[PDB]
A = this chain, B = another copy of it.
């Protein structure tokens, strides 16, 4: 019967907050599998959260389609009216090794435009949300655009194991310091908060970055491919989320000297 964004937001926040009741059990009985190789992990926590959201969607928004990490998405196209992108646990490695520093990522796109976004830092019970027209919130405290941050004054975050070492060194020298949380959504939220200058992921999936688009728009962040272009939310791309004042400097470092790949 046609809902407002706030009615949809109310349903989602409510389903997210009631996953607090479900997760301690999943964790107590955690089981791990591998996908691409031995370190590419998936657990019963990832699988249950995803399938519960599937079931939520069947039951509230049955027209709506789901693009999500732990299933095939062959059926998802260019011309989808109502689309949810989900990472049921972003930072699975941190879930398994630490039970901390992981989140649930959700993002709703209406005829391809980001309308609702969610990053649930469950270990710390901090629900980041973005709502087109209302703004961005952490547990309902409203977020505002961070202070300008030049790279020399700012902490940066990226996976240093996946890049050419010279370019890792150049990023070290040009920033104030380096930090890594190890969940794309959480390291992104440190940028949104203004705690990090920038977060780079040179090969994310759609679900690792899906919520961040609307955060970047509402809080005046740069979120681009490492070529400085728009990212297709339906497909990967190498990406940066950054404060406005250090975006260009970071991209120029990444692309210098033949670029950031190990073989250049």
Question: A residues engaging B (CB < 8 A)?
Answer: 39, 93-94, 97-101, 124, 154-155, 160-161, 165, 168-169, 172, 176-182, 190, 195-196
Contacts and interface: CB of A to CB of B under 8 A. Distances in A.
Nearest to A123: B124
B93 A177 contact: yes
Contact of A165 (B98, B155, B165, B181): B165
B177 A99 contact: no
B179 A181 contact: yes
A39 B161 CA distance: 24
A190 B178 CA distance: 18
B160 A178 contact: yes
B161 A195 contact: no
Contacts of A98: 155, 190, 195-196
A218 to B, nearest CB: 21
A190 B176 CA distance: 24
Contacts of A155: 93-94, 97-98, 182
Contact of A160 (B99, B124, B172): B172
Contacts of A94: 155, 179
Counting chain B CB atoms within 10 Å of each CB, which of A154, A168, A180 scores highest?
A: A180
Contacts of A182: 155, 177, 179
A97 B176 contact: yes
Given A93-B177, A165-B165, A178-B180, A100 B195 contact: yes
